[PDB]
Each structure stands twice: as C-alpha cells, then as structure tokens.
Design an enzyme around this catalytic site. Structure first.
Site, PDB file in Angstrom:
ATOM      1  N   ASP A  74       0.846  -1.187   0.000  1.00 28.67           N
ATOM      2  CA  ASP A  74       0.000   0.000   0.000  1.00 28.67           C
ATOM      3  C   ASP A  74       0.880   1.236   0.000  1.00 28.67           C
ATOM      4  O   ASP A  74       1.471   1.586   1.027  1.00 28.67           O
ATOM      5  CB  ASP A  74      -0.927   0.028   1.206  1.00 28.67           C
ATOM      6  CG  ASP A  74      -1.708   1.325   1.287  1.00 28.67           C
ATOM      7  OD1 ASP A  74      -1.948   1.935   0.226  1.00 28.67           O
ATOM      8  OD2 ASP A  74      -2.074   1.747   2.398  1.00 28.67           O
ATOM      9  N   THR A  97      -4.079   3.555  -5.153  1.00 32.15           N
ATOM     10  CA  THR A  97      -2.867   4.069  -4.537  1.00 32.15           C
ATOM     11  C   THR A  97      -1.676   3.253  -4.972  1.00 32.15           C
ATOM     12  O   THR A  97      -0.567   3.783  -5.093  1.00 32.15           O
ATOM     13  CB  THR A  97      -2.985   4.024  -3.020  1.00 32.15           C
ATOM     14  OG1 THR A  97      -3.652   2.813  -2.639  1.00 32.15           O
ATOM     15  CG2 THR A  97      -3.760   5.212  -2.515  1.00 32.15           C
ATOM     16  N   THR A  98      -1.901   1.967  -5.251  1.00 25.88           N
ATOM     17  CA  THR A  98      -0.914   1.142  -5.924  1.00 25.88           C
ATOM     18  C   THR A  98      -0.298   1.850  -7.125  1.00 25.88           C
ATOM     19  O   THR A  98       0.810   1.491  -7.537  1.00 25.88           O
ATOM     20  CB  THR A  98      -1.567  -0.173  -6.351  1.00 25.88           C
ATOM     21  OG1 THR A  98      -0.594  -1.031  -6.951  1.00 25.88           O
ATOM     22  CG2 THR A  98      -2.676   0.084  -7.337  1.00 25.88           C
ATOM     23  N   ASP A 157      -8.414  -2.466   3.455  1.00 32.49           N
ATOM     24  CA  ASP A 157      -8.667  -1.749   2.215  1.00 32.49           C
ATOM     25  C   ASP A 157      -9.751  -2.427   1.392  1.00 32.49           C
ATOM     26  O   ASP A 157     -10.622  -1.756   0.827  1.00 32.49           O
ATOM     27  CB  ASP A 157      -7.368  -1.636   1.425  1.00 32.49           C
ATOM     28  CG  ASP A 157      -6.282  -0.930   2.207  1.00 32.49           C
ATOM     29  OD1 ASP A 157      -6.600   0.058   2.902  1.00 32.49           O
ATOM     30  OD2 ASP A 157      -5.116  -1.373   2.147  1.00 32.49           O
TER      31      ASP A 157
END
Ligand SMILES: [Zn+2]
Lengths: 71, 527, 79, 522, 365, 106
Positions: B62, B95-96, B393
C-alpha cells in the site's frame, strides 16, 4: 559583497565635521606651547629615550595618528 | 548605493529557487517518487519494506503506508505523501499507482516546458483532458446496479483487489471473508457503512488460511475468574459499566464513622450490598455478565458462586460491539437492568489460541448483528499487519461499491480507451491545448507500461497491440494478460474495478498537478 | 433609549472570597442546591431586567447561566 | 585614561539622506519582485516553508508577505498595507504592492535630484485625490439598469475575483456556490457565520456547500455508534451545560452518618442527570448537542430512547447551528422550552474521506450555511480557504456597494491617460511627477503580459492608443492575447478595491518618502 | 483512529514537567489553559498529546491540536488513576507562584531600605527587613484552606523569568552586603530530618512530596536566629565571619552551589539553581522516586486498560511495570534536576546551629 | 496620593479630619476558621455577614460624620495608614466622604 570587502566609506557633513574636529584637536594640544611665557613639553619615544622640546614640530613629529587629515 | 543590507534575517541561509529551474527540479524530485512507486503496482508488482526510526520495520505494498512511513525532506514530496493518504482513505488501492499517474504526467509535462510552454495552459488542457476522461469513462463504464444480490461480482472485485497483495495466497477465502463481512454490516437503505462495525482482529500464529472472520465479537480478555468454565452454551448476557464495588459518589464524599454500630452496619452493609447486586443479576435471569471496569475479588467468587461468568476490564468500543451484536443494552446500574436489556448470542467460548500463551474469548452470536469481527491468524507479525491493511482496504472498495454500483474491468483497459478517446478529441482540439491533449494522453499511457514491465513482457509491444485491438475492436475490455493468460478479455478475466476508484483517482491527480504546475518559486530556510 | 448596566463586579454568583464550599448531610440538598443555584441567578438577573436594563457591562468574569439568563431576557453584555 | 563620551550606544547605526532613502526604494523594489509574478489570471503563486518545516503555499501575496518575515523596516510598512487591504478587499493586495513600489520606482530617478520630499507627496495626494473622484466619476451602478439580477453582477464579480486563485478552472462552479452562499448571509454580514470544512480528499469539484451546518467533528462515546444516525424531521436539543455525574460541578465535601443516607446520596447523584435526561426526553428533541462532554450513560438512554446526542461541540459551530435552525443554546434544562428548540428538515451523519461527519440542513429559515471543501491536498485546504474567504469578503462589499468597474488593467490605463492629459494642465515641477505618476500607473497590465509572456509594449502601445478615444473598458485579454472590452467580457471589479488600493499606495510612498535616516538599537 | 500508548520517555518529561507545574493540559471547559481547574482531556508528555480517557497518544506538540481528537478510545481510564499527577503539577503551579510572590516582598522590602539603615546595620548589625509571615501568600493552599489546590491559578507571565530575576537580585543584595537570611538552608535534607524544630515549628509532618494525602496548608517556616540576633558575643563581626551564605555556598555571583530555602510554603524547601549555572531556577526538594509513585495507579491502569503486546509495544521489553521499577532505579538521574544535587559539601556554619521555627522570614546584619 | 474614586470630592471648603490607621479593607480573622454552608441562599447570607463587620466600622464613622457634619457646607475627610475597601469607598461615596488610605507611618 561588492566594493572592496571591509573598506569603510564616509561622506558629507559628517566627514567635513570629522576633519574639523580632528583639526581642532590638533591645535589645542599645542595652543599652550607658544610664547615667551610658553610651556615646555616632554615626550615618550617608542624606543625608551626621553625628548623635551617646546618646538611643536618635533612634538608633532613624534605623534602617531589614524585620522588622515591629522596626519 | 551599493552596500549590504538585511531584508530577512538569516538572509545568508535563505536559499531561493525560481522559475523553470525550480520547476524541473520539482519534476526531477517527482520522477524519483514515481520511479520509487512504479514497481509497487499490480499482481506482478513487488512491495517495499520500511524501517522505523525506533528501529522497527514494515513491508508493504500500500503506497499510502509506504509514503506514510516515508521520511522525505523535499516539500513537494510530502504533498505527494499526503496526496496518496488523501486517495487511500478516499477510496483505497489504486494508490498502488496513484502517484505514478501524477509524475509521469509531470515528467512529460516538462517536455512541454522544454518546449517553453507556459504552465497555465498546461494546467488548463490537462484538466479539460481530465473531464474528457471521466465522461468517456463513465459512458463505457459497466454497472453492478444491474446485478442480482451481488454475491460474486464483489467476490471477483475482492479477488481483483487482493491480487495486488501478498495475502493472495488464499485470497479467494479472504475475498469471501470481506464480502460476507460487508454485506452483514451494510446499510443499503443508506449506501454507507461505518468501518467501526468491523472489528479487525489478527493474532499471530497458525497459517494464513487460519484467518477466519467471526460472525460475532472476539475479546482479548479471559475469564474474570480462572475457575469459571471456558465454554458457555446459552447466552443470557449482562452488559455492565458499574464495577462490582461499593458505589462511591464522585463528588467529594466521605463518611465520618463514630460508634461501634456505625462500624458494624457498614461492615454489615459491606457484604450486604454485594449479595444485593448478586441477587439483582440473578433475578435478571442472565447467564453471563460483563463489566467494563473492575471487580472485587470477593464478589467475583460470589459471582462465580452462582455460575454466572463475567468479564472485567473490557474496553469501551468492543462492549457496544458486544451490545449491538447481541442487540443488548448498556445499563450503568444494578437495579435498572432488566432481562429485556440482556444480550443474547449463539455461543461464547474463550480460545486458548496460543500454544504457550494466555487466551482469547470469542462470542459466536447466532442472531443478526450489525457488528462483526474478523480473526486473522498467520506466521508473522508484519504479515498480520500487511493482511489487516490489505483486508482493511478491501472492505472500503466494496463500501465504495456500495456507494456506486457501476464498475469497469481493470487491468489497464479503462484509461487506455480514454487516451484514445482523448486522442480523438485532440484532432478537434484546436490550438496549443492540442499539444496539451496528446501530452496528457501520452502521459496517461504509462500505467499499462508499468504493468507489462512488472509483467516482464515488452511493455510497448504489449500495449501497441492492446491499443490496436481496442482500436480495431470497440470493446473496452482488453487490458494486460498479467498472469500470462492468452485472453485480453479482462471482463472474462474478471479483473474489474469501480468507476469511482479511477474516477476520483485521476480527477484527484489532475488538481494536484495543477498546483504542481502552479508554483514557480521557493525560499527554503537553511537548516 | 439605552439602559446601560455597569459592574466592576464580575457576572457570577457573588463568590464569597473566603471558602464556603457546599456541604450536604442529606440527599435533597443536591437537588435543591443547584436548582436554587440556578433559581436565584434567574432572580438576580430578573431583578436587573425589572429595571429595564438592556445592556450590562463588566471586564470581570461572567457566569454562563447568568448570560444564559440575560439572553433569555434580551440583554446586552460587555467583557 | 580619558575617553570621549559616545553619543548613543555602541553600534547604534545611522545612515541618512539620499543613499539612505534610496536603499529602501530598492528594498521596496526587492519586495515586489517576490510578488511580481503573483496576481493575474495567468499570474503566479508561491510556496514558502517555515524554519519549522511546515510548508505553506500561497497565491495571495499578503499571505506570502506575512510568511515573508521582513527585517527591513520600511518594507514592513508595505507588509502592513497588505493586511489593511486584505482586511479591506483581498487579492490585488498582490497589485497593491506593485503600485507602491512602481510609484517609488519611477520617483527614485527624480529622487536622484535632491528634491524636497514634501514637493513629491504633495502631487501624490493631489494625484491620488483627483484619481479617486475620477474613479468615482466612472463608477458603474446597475440597480438603475435593467438586465441585472441583483446576484448576476455578484456572480460576475467573483469570477473576476476568482479567476486568479488555485481553483481558477472552477470559478463558474464556485461562483454560484458562494454567491448563493453569501446570499444567505443576510443581514449580520460577518464572515464568522458561515463555516468552512477543510475535508481532506475528494475532488475539489466535489467540494460541497450545504444549506445548513455539519461537523468534521464528533467523538467516540460508548453507544455513540449505537443510536440511530438518521433523523428525518428531528427536534434539536442544544446544550452548553455538561451531562455527567458532577464531573466538574461545585467543589463540595459531604458528611453522612447513616449508611443508607450514604446509599441515598449516590442515587441522588444519579437522580440529577436522570432528572436532567427526563427534562431532555420530555422536551421532545431527538438530537442533543453540547460543547461540553456527555456522560456515556445518558447516551445509552438517548440510544435506548431512539434519540441522538452529542458532546464536546465547538462553541462556534453551535452558534452557527443555533443561528441556523433558530434554536437557542441552553444551560438550564428546567427552563427549557420548545421555542429554544432548533428544528431542521432532516438530520444525518456521513463518512467523507474516512472522516465521521454529521448532517442536518434544509432548515428554510437559516442565515448560515457551511462549506464542505473536498480536496486531496492538505495545502489545498488553507489556500482554497484563502481563496474561499477572499471571495466571500469582497462580494459582501459587493452586496454592500452597487459599484463595479471593469478589470484587466483597463481602469489603470483609463486612469493614466486621464491624468496624463491633466498633466498638461499643470505647469512646472509637478507636471513631471504627474507624468511619472501615470507612468508607474500602467504597470498592472504590463505585469499581466509578462505573466502571460506577451509583448506588452505593443499591447500597451495599442492599449493607450485605443484608449485615446475608442472606449473606456478596453483591456487585456489573455486568451486573445490583446485588447478587448473586458467589461462586456465581464471582467468586473468593485471600484472600492482599486479605490482603496491606490489610496493606501499613495500614503505608502508618502510614508516612504517621508524618511531621511534610520536609527538602530540592539 | 487507533491510538498507541506513549513511550516511557514521554512519561518521564510529563513527570518532570509536572513537578515544575508546567504540564500542558487540554480540557473541554478551558481548552489548553490551566488557570481554571478542569478535568484533563488531553495532556502533553514529551512531544506528544494523549487522550486521558484511553491513554493512546492522540497527537504531537508540533501538531498543535485544538481538540481531543476523535479516535477509537478505550475510555478505560478513570480520572482517579492520574489525578495524583494532576494533583502535583497544580500544587507545584500554586507553590511556585506563592514562592514567586514571597521573594518579591523581601526584594521589595530590601530595596525600600534607606541607605543609612543599611549603612548602620552593615556596621552595627541588627534587623534590616522582617517580612511578616502572616503576609506570606495568605490566600494560597499552603497557608489557608479558604483556598484549595483546584483554585484558579494566579495568572503570572514570565514566572520562571521573574523567579530567576528576583532570586538573583535578592541574593546579590545579600551577597554584596553579606546579610543573614533566616529562610535558607545548606542541605534541604536537613529540613525533614536532623534539624531542631523550635516552639511552634513542631507540628510539622513532612510529606516530602505533593500528594492528596498530605495536608498541605501549613505555616511559613524560617530559622530561629533570635539567639544569634541578640547575642553580643555573636555580634556584627562574628556573623560576617560565619553566618552569611557566601561562607557556605560561595559568593552568589561566583558559585554553582544551589541555594535552598526553609519550608516556606507547603512544608517544601525550594532549590534555587546557582547563578553560574546560567539561571537561578527554583525547585521543590522532592525525590524522583516519590515523583514516580504518582503514576503507580496509572501503571496499574494500563495493566487493565491495555493489552500486554500493546503495553510491551510502547514500553518495550517489560512493559510499564518493568519500566516503572527500572525507572525507579534511574529516578536519581531521570527525575532529578541537578541543582538538587549541587549543594555545598564543605560546611562551616551549616543548618544545625539554630532550630527551624514558624515565624517571620527576615534578614539582619 | 489621591482619592480612589471619581465621585470623590476633589476640593472641599472646610475640612473635618479623620486620622486613622485601622484597615477599612476587608480582613479575615487570625484563626483558621473554615466555614461551610448548605444553601446558595446562605451563600448570599454568608455574603452579607462577611461584610457586616466592616459595614459597622464605616457605619460608626458615617454616623459620627452625620453627627458631626449635619451641616451640608462642611466637608469630611479621612486618612488611613492602611488600605480601604472599594465597597467602603462606595460607602463613603454615597455619603460624599473624602477618605485616604495607605499613609506612611509618620
Ligand atoms: Zn482516548
């Protein structure tokens, strides 16, 4: 850093006053030294000896100064 | 005249960079962060390990965590850092690659700057390109509103969202783990869900597969008294705040005992009070009690004396998790508790989960319960920690999906169509925003290249073919054969993603880079 | 027609400078004290309002219920 | 060992006269260059980080200047002006500096001549004086006209005000918001009323204006999740008095003989808040809000009784809230009445950016709204607020005065030509000062074309020439890169802004011009 | 959000800050201003801010919080588990203010001396100033129970600055004129054990700490120099040679030795840092191990408010208990202003030549 | 030093003099004397009682003044070596009485 890097400058009325003051100093340290009723002064040389003379020149001749107009 | 003068203190150590040189400098910094993150995306991506100032470590994929752990000194970097933090709690993974979107855009943005092109228009066109992207995107967006009870679109989406994480070992299970978890706690009447209703619980030990969601609540507390029996079948539950001691009015209060009988009655009362509430709970007909605060060792045994196990020193949030999961209430008083307020559940049993440790308590409630917990077991502390965040997540996107039931097959197909959709406009663009178009479009292209590079395949030989098919065909469902499966139909490959995820993502990115383009000058204080 | 109220006195129950803390010996004093504690403050501020004062001034401390009462009585305050 | 007596302390610096005076003039010129790029639809913004490491971006120079901790004194005056103008009208504070320095700038060559400052400012006061009234002459009202909605011009003003700041591409979005938002502000007209919520994350185009009040704020209490979070047409409880068993009540020792009397005491302790709660439940409100903390136990009762409650509320948003639904904040639960009760169309509470928000609006009679400011950048939040606030305060002045002018430097060019012709009227030493006065005046478009990278001279040569006769409100177009009627282009500014701008600038130099030496004490 | 416990280091400062009365406390009623007492909602320990109801670190000093921030708080902390530290600091805060006001009076009265009387006493000896101890901070908790420890804090800005000024100035007046204080002691360990308490001094029960179990309203204590003062064989010359501070502490302007007081307020001697240390900083003579016990309930609180891995997480190996016991051994270093360890060792006049009494602080020649 | 109240008469034709040193500021007695109450009504009743002692003190003078200065023309002045209560100041103020506090012992 611009001009000469630690050389001071001065201008104008302050300068002119400074010379006048320096000038005024120069005379008074001698104003007593003239006349048939004058004084007689004794001096400390750099090198140990002793000089006593009324003639102002030698007195001034033995004077170290920084103010230029004085010099 | 010419002579030194002071405008700001420490004028010597007030450095200052202005204009294009500063601009590119930030771009140079930006690319580093981009190149820092490129490897972190996708199932073939590889995750990073951070080392804490107090010497601790953390391995993760993450990027939000990665940057949150990151200690930069360049200010724009921190903007990127919080940027990802802003995206994560906004959506989650993606976000990766979120920052990776920005900088490559910035990298090429400088190319326009190298063409002397003024940032203001560059700010202008990309935003227009951004609006272009979304209205194209949602047009070609699929929906899961059209779906029946959404059991396994979500499972696929969970399956998708977990392929980026090392917990992919048994991720199918965890995909099921979350979807059950979320559906239980969801308010379809609201399109929202509070993550507080979710109790993450990961205790090291056992295999990853030993990770097990619990339709109930688990307690990091053992029995109040060791002789109290470990299992309890019936679940007549008492939920208490008032600790089992003499009540003491918290206004400054004190008694002033004088005579013998003064001593005795209180001494007499001292036990008499305990029997009272001991009677009181007994008359309630509960089977099990639980207290937030302390016990007296005496009445504890007396409470054990009537086969009514209780729990002492229970943390706040959980107690209500107990209460709501039981449907139960919280009474502060002995007298005012009645059986109606009592909690009920399917099963409660302490677990000697550790081979060599003190134990845990679980409540296998059997009715409906708007709160729930997940129990994680596995071999490493950080592995637990990675799972939690990864698991944490995965919840959000389904929550995110709850807000919007329209998604797109992921795998890089989505934006690919956009740049093409962007590019088609770029011909009807007219001027210099015309350059601005292809620039951002060219900027957008990186993400698949990130994939295939992380796939080890030729990035360009891939996407060039990928475009042409999505050029030759009209189906926007051809991404990257990430796991080496000769089918580009990611729709059949089921690699899918919510509309908003990308939608907020790039839209977020645009505004940031707008500010990024917006600044020219910095005055840094000397350290 | 402005009705100005001036008090170097702070706007709170007149705190006797020496320590009178309430001490109780039975229960109802709890109920009675704070209620009257409210009650006379209302009586205090009302007695002010009975004179028609629409604005009150002080630099000193203001009791929250007292200004709460003044607001109940459409009064102006200074601080 | 005699020594001459010094005048003042050692190192008590002095420097006097022309070289002394000019140094500041350069110093002022130094100041503007840090702000030179700033204002303009294609203008610029800066980032400055403190020695603490907390970075701060800004487009409003006054903010930048406040960051720019000046050590030169005369410059601080410039910095002060910004605060005044910012406390007055806002951006163009940007411009305000540039006028100031440019006036000094062109004066400096005449300062080279040993000219008595009193001459210099005399024209300035006059030049300023005539300018304002000429500005006053060319002031534009619309309530006399026909094709204005009393809000349309305000909408036009903001876009003009807005089309420099960080959300410049969303002016047409925000403009309606704030114009609608400012519209509800009647009639107290203080900015403290409407809240701003720097809610992290989310697209700024998703930033929300709510016709009501909400909170970024809450706090974990026991049942705080348990009670319902939907309240469809609720009745609103607003408490300042805390709710807990004598947590912070009067200091009091107690003495009691009978154990049962001690028994009775703690019950009486609880009997209070129960009685209080009984007031509350019997009141008929369902949502209880309090600056003070709430006893967890009562929350159970509210949760048990299907009422909402809240504690630790800010005083400010409470005032906003009580202002909004009209309900009245209370301290005595007994003296309660439904008159002091707020009511809203609905109550809710929502997650946004992970954060726990609380929703209630639709109260038709509420002069206060709130601003949900979605945005993924921490630095966006304050900066947008600086934009957000600045927009608010000016348009309030716009509501204050039905006086607008065109933007894009047209006014200033219109001014310069007018004074330039007036300069012909005045013979003698003053005329040059007027000539310089107009000369420094036109700086504003010139900066624009620089910040637009345009051949401002040819534009200016076109500008002044076309401004000889052909029309007042011709001015710079960024996109067409040339002259246009910015007024019909709706580049519309309240007059008082520049009105104030030049005035403050005038006194600025006048203050600046009025100095012969500096004295320093350690 | 989740919260974590503070590290032991963050506790130590908060402990150390508390016995200087400078702990930053956040309250709903008062915010961060501790003038008016309120139940603490947040406090600063080290650089961090912690929720007092869960004891999870909820922020940092750099983060400049305005509110107890929302977090997943165990709310498992009661006021009683930390009020003792809440007790010491406010008591410290009140004590320094009273200690601040007292010295100013002597300094005020020292400067109100006409030249001749000082000239006369310098040659002749005799009382110069006698500050009526009935005037000593008459409204604080260490003089009358009409006050309390909870009472609003007398608002004093630059407290340490003024304390530094007035001590140093007063000592120089004594140092320059070699005067004789009846309120100073060569080793405050003597104040509690070894000195004579005379006449009305005798009720004193020294708690040596600031705790709720002490009855901290107590008389203003000074030495009984009456036998010295009216003794012809101990007249002006003898007292110069023996009794004046510089004999035992060294010259105030040329000594690092700490200068300590009689138990003026709260039966607690003050510890003033030496002028050569760079400041004249005042301390109550309280042992660090007694400081540590202020947290013993809280240590237990965490024992039943936090899980072991969470406790071991933030406290390291051993958690808080081993930390507490370990810190107890390190209190002479970690809870100890050095000035309390910088008193003179070569003693000529000392503290055991005259009893401590309750009476007027005074200075004579 | 001067009077501490604006209504205080700046000038008086004929002065009748009160020389004194006893404080007409509040004072609380030399013994620890912890009181309580149980009612806020008593709290106010405790308000008035506390003042009453000084109330009589000033009362003795005013009657004397009024026993002395029954004439309107005469002016009455007071001098204290210690300080004076503002309420006492007000007490004199309503009577238009000049009084001074905190005089040097000589
Ligand atoms: Zn907490």
């Amino acid at each position: 850093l611009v001009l000469s890097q630690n050389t001071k400058r001065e201008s104008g009325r302050k300068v002119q006053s400074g010379n006048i003051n320096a000038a005024k100093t120069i005379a008074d340290i001698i104003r007593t030294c003239l006349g048939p009723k004058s004084m007689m002064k004794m001096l400390l040389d750099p090198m140990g000896g002793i000089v006593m003379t009324n003639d102002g020149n030698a007195i001034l001749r033995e004077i170290q100064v920084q103010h230029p107009a004085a010099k | 005249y010419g002579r030194p003068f002071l405008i700001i203190k420490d004028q010597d150590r007030k450095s200052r960079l202005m204009g294009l040189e500063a601009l590119k400098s930030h771009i140079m910094a930006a690319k580093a962060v981009a190149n820092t993150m490129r490897t972190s995306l996708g199932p073939n991506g590889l995750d990073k390990m951070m080392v804490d100032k107090d010497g601790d470590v953390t391995v993760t994929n993450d990027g939000a965590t990665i940057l949150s752990m990151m200690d930069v000194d360049h200010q724009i970097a921190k903007l990127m850092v919080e940027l990802s933090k802003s995206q994560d709690d906004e959506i989650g993974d993606g976000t990766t690659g979120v920052v990776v979107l920005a900088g490559a855009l910035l990298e090429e943005a400088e190319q326009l700057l190298d063409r002397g092109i003024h940032p203001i228009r560059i700010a202008d066109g990309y935003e227009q390109a951004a609006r272009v992207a979304i209205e194209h995107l949602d047009k070609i967006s699929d929906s899961v509103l059209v779906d029946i009870k959404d059991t396994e679109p979500l499972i696929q989406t969970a399956k998708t969202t977990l392929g980026s994480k090392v917990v992919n070992s048994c991720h199918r299970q965890m995909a099921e783990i979350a979807v059950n978890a979320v559906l239980t706690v969801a308010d379809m009447e609201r399109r929202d869900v509070d993550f507080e209703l979710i109790k993450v619980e990961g205790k090291v030990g056992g295999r990853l597969e030993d990770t097990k969601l619990i339709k109930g609540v688990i307690v990091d507390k053992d029995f109040s008294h060791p002789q109290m029996p470990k299992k309890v079948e019936d679940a007549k539950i008492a939920i208490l705040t008032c600790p089992f001691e003499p009540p003491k009015p918290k206004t400054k209060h004190k008694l002033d005992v004088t005579s013998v009988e003064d001593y005795k009655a209180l001494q007499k009362y001292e036990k008499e009070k305990f029997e009272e509430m001991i009677q009181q709970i007994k008359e309630t007909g509960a089977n099990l009690a639980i207290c937030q605060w302390g016990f007296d060792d005496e009445a504890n045994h007396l409470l054990l004396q009537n086969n009514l196990p209780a729990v002492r020193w229970v943390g706040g949030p959980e107690i209500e998790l107990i209460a709501i999961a039981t449907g139960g209430r919280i009474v502060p008083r002995f007298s005012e508790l009645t059986a109606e307020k009592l909690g009920f559940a399917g099963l409660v049993q302490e677990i000697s989960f550790g081979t060599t440790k003190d134990k845990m308590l679980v409540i296998e409630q059997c009715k409906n319960s708007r709160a729930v917990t997940i129990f994680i077991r596995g071999g490493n502390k950080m592995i637990i920690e990675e799972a939690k965040r990864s698991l944490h997540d995965a919840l959000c996107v389904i929550r995110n999906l709850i807000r919007d039931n329209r998604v797109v097959y992921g795998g890089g197909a989505a934006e690919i169509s956009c740049a093409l959709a962007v590019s088609q406009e770029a011909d009807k663009c007219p001027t210099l925003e015309q350059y601005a178009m292809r620039a951002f479009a060219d900027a957008l292209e990186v993400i698949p290249m990130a994939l295939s590079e992380n796939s080890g395949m030729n990035p360009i030989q891939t996407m060039t073919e990928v475009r042409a098919r999505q050029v030759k065909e009209m189906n926007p469902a051809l991404g990257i054969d990430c796991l080496h499966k000769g089918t580009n139909d990611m729709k059949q490959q089921h690699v899918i993603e919510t509309l908003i995820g990308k939608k907020q993502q790039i839209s977020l990115a645009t505004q940031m880079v707008r500010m990024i383009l917006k600044i020219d000058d910095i005055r840094k204080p000397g350290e | 027609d402005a009705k100005i109220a001036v008090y170097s006195c702070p706007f709170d129950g007149m705190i006797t400078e020496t320590k009178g803390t309430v001490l109780i010996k039975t229960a109802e004093e709890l109920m009675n004290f704070s209620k009257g504690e409210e009650n006379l403050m209302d009586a205090q501020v009302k007695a002010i309002a009975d004179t028609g004062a629409n604005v009150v001034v002080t630099g000193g401390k203001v009791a929250d219920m007292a200004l709460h009462y003044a607001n109940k009585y459409n009064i102006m305050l200074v601080r | 060992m005699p020594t001459p007596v010094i005048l003042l302390k050692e190192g008590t610096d002095s420097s006097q006269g022309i070289p002394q005076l000019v140094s500041n003039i350069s110093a002022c010129q130094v100041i503007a260059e840090a702000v030179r790029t700033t204002l303009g639809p294609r203008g610029m913004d800066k980032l400055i980080v403190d020695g603490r490491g907390k970075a701060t971006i800004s487009n409003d120079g006054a903010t930048i200047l406040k960051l720019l901790d000046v050590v030169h004194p005369a410059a601080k005056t410039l910095v002060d002006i910004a605060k005044s103008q910012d406390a007055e009208v806002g951006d163009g504070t940007t411009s305000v500096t540039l006028l100031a320095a440019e006036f000094l700038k062109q004066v400096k060559p005449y300062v080279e001549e040993g000219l008595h400052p009193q001459i210099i400012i005399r024209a300035f006061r006059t030049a300023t004086q005539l300018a304002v009234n000429k500005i006053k002459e060319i002031a534009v009202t619309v309530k006399k006209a026909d094709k204005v909605e009393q809000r349309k011009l305000l909408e036009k003003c903001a876009m003009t005000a807005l089309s420099s700041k960080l959300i410049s591409q969303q002016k047409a979005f925000f403009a309606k918001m704030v114009v609608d938002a400012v519209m509800m502000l009647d009639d107290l007209l203080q900015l403290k009323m409407i809240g701003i919520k720097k809610v992290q994350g989310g697209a700024l185009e998703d930033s929300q204006l709510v016709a009501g009040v909400a909170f970024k704020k809450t706090f974990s209490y026991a049942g705080f999740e348990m009670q319902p979070k939907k309240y469809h047409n609720p009745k609103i409880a607003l408490l300042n008095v805390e709710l807990e068993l004598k947590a912070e009540k009067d200091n009091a020792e107690i003495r009691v003989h009978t154990v049962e009397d001690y028994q009775a005491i703690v019950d009486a302790e609880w009997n209070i808040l129960y009685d209080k709660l009984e007031k509350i439940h019997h009141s008929g409100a369902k949502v209880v809000l309090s600056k003070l903390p709430i006893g967890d136990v009562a929350t159970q009762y509210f949760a048990d009784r299907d009422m909402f409650c809240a504690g630790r509320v800010p005083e400010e948003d409470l005032k906003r809230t009580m202002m909004a639904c009209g309900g009245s904040i209370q301290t005595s639960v007994n003296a309660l009445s439904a008159d002091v009760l707020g009511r809203c169309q609905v109550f809710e509470e929502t997650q946004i950016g992970g954060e726990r928000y609380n929703f209630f609006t639709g109260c038709p009679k509420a002069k206060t709204c709130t601003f949900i400011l979605r945005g993924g950048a921490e630095q966006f939040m304050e900066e947008t607020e600086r934009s957000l606030h600045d927009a608010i305060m000016i348009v309030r002045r716009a509501i204050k005065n039905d006086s607008v002018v065109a933007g894009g430097g047209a006014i200033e060019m219109e001014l310069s030509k007018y004074l330039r012709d007036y300069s012909r009227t005045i013979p003698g030493k003053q005329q040059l000062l007027i000539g310089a006065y107009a000369k420094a005046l036109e700086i504003i478009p010139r900066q624009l074309c620089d910040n637009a990278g345009f051949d401002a001279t040819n534009i200016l040569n076109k500008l002044r020439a076309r401004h000889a006769q052909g029309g007042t409100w011709y001015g710079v177009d960024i996109n067409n890169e040339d002259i246009a009627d910015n007024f019909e282009a709706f580049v519309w500014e309240p007059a008082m802004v520049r009105i104030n701008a030049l005035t403050a600038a005038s006194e600025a130099a006048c203050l600046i011009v009025s100095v012969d030496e500096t004295i320093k004490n350690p | 959000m989740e919260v974590c416990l503070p590290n032991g280091h963050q506790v130590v400062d908060l402990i150390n800050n508390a016995f200087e009365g400078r702990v930053s406390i956040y309250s709903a009623q008062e915010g961060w201003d501790k003038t008016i007492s309120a139940q603490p909602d947040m406090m600063v320990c080290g650089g961090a801010v912690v929720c007092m109801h869960c004891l999870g670190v909820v922020g940092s000093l750099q983060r400049k919080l305005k509110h107890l921030p929302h977090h997943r708080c165990n709310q498992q902390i009661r006021h009683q588990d930390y009020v003792d530290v809440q007790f010491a600091d406010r008591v410290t805060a009140h004590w320094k203010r009273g200690m601040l006001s007292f010295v100013a009076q002597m300094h005020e009265m020292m400067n109100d001396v006409s030249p001749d009387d000082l000239d006369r006493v310098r040659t002749e000896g005799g009382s110069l100033v006698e500050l009526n101890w009935l005037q000593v901070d008459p409204n604080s908790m260490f003089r009358s129970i009409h006050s309390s420890w909870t009472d609003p804090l007398q608002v004093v800005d630059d407290l340490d600055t003024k304390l530094d000024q007035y001590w140093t100035a007063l000592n120089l007046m004594i140092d320059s004129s070699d005067l004789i204080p009846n309120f100073m002691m060569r080793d405050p360990s003597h104040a509690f054990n070894g000195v004579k308490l005379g006449g009305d001094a005798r009720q004193t029960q020294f708690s040596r700490t600031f705790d709720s179990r002490s009855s901290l309203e107590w008389g203003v204590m000074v030495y009984d120099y009456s036998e010295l003062e009216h003794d012809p064989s101990k007249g002006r010359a003898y007292r110069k040679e023996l009794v004046t501070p510089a004999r035992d502490f060294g010259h105030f302007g040329l000594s690092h030795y700490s200068r300590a007081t009689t138990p003026i307020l709260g039966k607690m001697p003050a510890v003033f840092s030496g002028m050569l240390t760079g400041n004249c900083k005042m301390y109550p003579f309280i042992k660090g191990t007694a400081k540590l016990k202020t947290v013993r309930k809280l240590v237990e609180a965490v024992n039943h408010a936090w899980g072991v891995e969470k406790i071991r997480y933030a406290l390291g190996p051993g958690g808080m208990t081993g930390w507490y016991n370990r810190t107890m051994q390190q209190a002479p270093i970690v809870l100890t202003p050095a000035a309390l360890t910088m008193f003179p060792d070569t003693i000529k006049f000392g503290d055991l030549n005259y009893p401590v009494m309750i009476g007027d602080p005074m200075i004579l020649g | 030093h001067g009077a501490r109240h604006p209504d205080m008469k700046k000038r008086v034709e004929d002065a009748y003099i009160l020389t004194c040193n006893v404080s007409l500021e509040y004072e609380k007695t030399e013994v620890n004397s912890g009181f309580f109450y149980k009612s806020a009504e008593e709290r106010e009743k405790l308000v008035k009682a506390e003042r009453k002692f000084i109330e009589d003190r000033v009362k003795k003078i005013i009657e004397l003044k009024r026993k002395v200065c029954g004439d309107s023309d005469k002016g009455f002045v007071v001098i204290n070596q210690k300080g004076i209560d503002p309420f006492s100041l007000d007490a004199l103020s309503k009577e238009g009485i000049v009084a001074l506090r905190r005089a040097k012992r000589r």
